[PDB]
Ligand binder design. Structure first.
Ligand SMILES: *[C@@H]1O[C@H](CO)[C@@H](O[C@@H]2O[C@H](CO)[C@@H](O)[C@H](O)[C@H]2NC(C)=O)[C@H](O)[C@H]1NC(C)=O
Ligand SMILES: *[C@@H]1O[C@H](CO)[C@@H](O[C@@H]2O[C@H](CO)[C@@H](O)[C@H](O)[C@H]2NC(C)=O)[C@H](O)[C@H]1NC(C)=O
Ligand SMILES: *[C@@H]1O[C@H](CO)[C@@H](O[C@@H]2O[C@H](CO)[C@@H](O)[C@H](O)[C@H]2NC(C)=O)[C@H](O)[C@H]1NC(C)=O
Ligand SMILES: *[C@@H]1O[C@H](CO)[C@@H](O[C@@H]2O[C@H](CO)[C@@H](O)[C@H](O)[C@H]2NC(C)=O)[C@H](O)[C@H]1NC(C)=O
Ligand SMILES: [Cs+]
Ligand SMILES: [Cs+]
Lengths: 379, 379
């Protein structure tokens, strides 16, 4: 047919992590009446001009190729945006070539930050001192951000600490320089030290359907053997999902029933001390989905009114953005194309140049969906 | 601790398709008390011996590297099988270097098979004759297996046909040699020809949650302009999901409500001819999931009875296979390890050598899941 508007035969696949040096083949698998042309876009910037080549090939990936890719397909009838593809590249930088020094007063917690290093994705970190692998315990913690936390420090904890960082996707590993931790005398004259939260749990947001999410709370106290960290929800202690000496709470398969405030509570068992508390809030993201889509093809007569419906649901409420032939409506500046509050597109007096592909995108923090129609105008 | 049995920190990811020549990095991301050792397996065959290296790296993938990979992790306490990883490699072979000949009698359908070619995944095929791209129409069909079907042949259809095959994953393309189709005179003396099904729909099975599934039915008749192909279910014609001149029925998001028999029906409109019919059956596969798992760690006293529960649901009913320290129970040939019909493992008189990792796999055609426990035996 001479009247087949462009459409995609296959949608691009889920985000995959790619290795430096590997070949990458992107493809624009579209059909339609010909001349059929394709161009590529990276980060809303034009990579290629229009031609009959539907492939975009990177012979050897480097880190600067990481980004969002999409093709546009066009024939005489209109232009259609492919849904975005997320191309991540696994890479591991270097540690800065310098030692660091840190001093803490006996009895306080020492928080040793993982030395600056750029890595995708974030590495797995093993902490060392004098070739001895440091294992989490009731007194030693390693945060979700790979920081080493030594609780209730003593003179024995002084020394030179370092990391082996491993990028699990490309296999590369790096050793950091030293952090020289010194431990000075106790502040004042106090044997026991009340619980104090040194790593507070953060606000957490997770996308619906995710397997797990983990909150973390680390407290200092002395004697550390009496220290108890526990998690409360709705004023009542939680009993399941606890890990790493009670410092990690993992919620599995989180739904909206698990949203809201969580409280971690640190106590010295049997003591007269007040507990230390910190609050964290858990939020669920519902990716967008359409509740009203237009027909694939619509015929209007010149001079009549046209309505193209598009409505989407999600948490948070999705924002809708319209395109005509792969140009956003804001750029076209067409006073006859009215966007309705519910989301639909209203066209007051159809004109022959209104013919083409209208495309609606709904997006929030947790995803993006698309629907489109070919508008045909007669006479 | 000296008593941490091996466990995985991260499960391997979903099946990805890899390109020839690309680097591949597999990783065995397990923790536990050390010495901790790892070995790799490809297609139930041992690739490497046990060592402290948790990575397996293929510098440059070739087709013969395609297969199922998994690591075993072991310390003194026991051995644990990683869940399998499916490594497919995109490849495209060559057509055989020979022309073919085919003769059909005028009015009959000509079924032109795509010339033998090994390819992963199956290529996208465009059929040609004299440089002219052949487009599907009411008289020309291209099956889901890339065969060209010319209905109600005429002398004009004689000529040399060929294909451009494109592997969409690695971008490679091949042109085939020619099929020389000849069209001989009509058989007998008949103007109209009743509908006959030349490509019958097949039994289809699909995994639950799949986006789409498509059935295909192609009929011959003359005059082809009067030919109508339609789909029936429960004795009543289906109205939605039809494609390619009614020859394709796509069921979107198939559930068990769509299982059973579908009928395609070919008629010559307004004619006295009987319809031609073919039946196809659609089946849904439910991947396995557990309905009863054992605790992560279990303590038995010597000489007592132990029960390790494992029960799974799925369509078809999953089969359960047990392992101890990554050795299947059938090999161990231990008369004290009894497998119950519901799935659980029964151990009559616990002995010290029963300590270790017991691992239960449930599988059917649509997936495989695993659960495990560390059995500790005292005294
Ligand atoms: C394309 O856009 C992505 C998304 O913003 C960019 O990713 C950022 O890259 C910079 C480094 O250049 C980092 O500092 C940011 O943290 C990254 N943000 C995210 C969300 O990933 C990417 O660099 C862009 N690529 C190009 C070529 O423009
Ligand atoms: C973490 O999330 C909580 C929960 O929303 C935030 O608390 C809100 O803070 C604003 C800012 O003053 C208040 O006006 C609201 O009353 C709070 N909402 C609720 C439901 O209590 C908090 O600000 C967030 N903090 C960070 C650092 O992200
Ligand atoms: C590993 O097992 C898979 C699964 O059977 C093998 O895949 C088969 O490969 C042969 C060619 O060698 C094909 O003829 C079959 O059709 C394939 N079957 C499937 C289900 O994919 C794979 O070849 C095996 N690889 C090794 C190295 O043993
Ligand atoms: C396609 O599926 C149908 C549906 O199950 C199969 O029909 C069965 O065939 C057996 C073999 O003689 C009969 O005993 C059963 O009565 C049939 N079942 C039903 C529900 O009708 C058919 O054999 C399959 N054919 C192919 C080629 O796969
Ligand atoms: Cs649509
Ligand atoms: Cs378990």
């Amino acid at each position: 047919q001479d009247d087949v508007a462009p459409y995609f035969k296959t949608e691009p696949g889920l985000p995959q992590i790619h290795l430096e040096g590997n070949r990458l083949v992107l493809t624009c698998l579209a059909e339609g009446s010909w001349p059929l042309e394709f161009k590529w876009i990276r980060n809303d910037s034009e990579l290629t001009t229009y031609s009959s080549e539907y492939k975009y090939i990177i012979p050897s990936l480097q880190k600067l190729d990481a980004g969002f890719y999409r093709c546009v397909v066009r024939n005489r009838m209109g232009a259609l945006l492919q849904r975005k593809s997320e191309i991540q590249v696994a890479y591991m930088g270097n540690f800065m070539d310098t030692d660091q020094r840190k001093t803490v007063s006996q009895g306080h917690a020492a928080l040793l930050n993982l030395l600056p290093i750029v890595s995708c994705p974030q590495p797995q970190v093993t902490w060392f001192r004098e070739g001895h692998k440091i294992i989490p315990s009731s007194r030693i913690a390693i945060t979700l951000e790979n920081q080493l936390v030594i609780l209730a420090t003593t003179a024995s904890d002084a020394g030179a600490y370092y990391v082996q960082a491993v990028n699990e996707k490309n296999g590369e590993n790096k050793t950091s320089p030293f952090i020289h931790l010194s431990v000075a005398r106790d502040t004042g004259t106090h044997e026991a030290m009340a619980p104090i939260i040194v790593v507070a749990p953060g606000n957490r947001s997770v996308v619906a359907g995710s397997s797990e999410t983990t909150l973390e709370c680390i407290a200092n106290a002395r004697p550390v053997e009496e220290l108890s960290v526990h998690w409360k929800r709705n004023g009542v202690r939680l009993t399941s999902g606890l890990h790493s000496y009670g410092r990690r709470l993992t919620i599995t398969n989180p739904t909206s029933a698990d949203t809201g405030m969580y409280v971690c509570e640190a106590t010295l068992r049997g003591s007269t001390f007040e507990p230390a508390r910190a609050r964290a809030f858990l939020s669920i993201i519902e990716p967008p989905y359409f509740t009203a889509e237009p027909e694939s093809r619509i015929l209007g007569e010149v001079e009549e009114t046209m309505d193209i419906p598009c409505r989407a649901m999600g948490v948070p409420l999705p924002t809708l953005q319209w395109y005509k032939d792969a140009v956003p409506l804001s750029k076209l500046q067409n006073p006859r194309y009215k966007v309705l509050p519910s989301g639909g597109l209203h066209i007051q007096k159809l004109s022959p140049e209104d013919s083409g592909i209208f495309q609606c995108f709904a997006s929030n923090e947790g995803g993006e969906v698309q629907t489109h129609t070919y508008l045909d105008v007669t006479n």
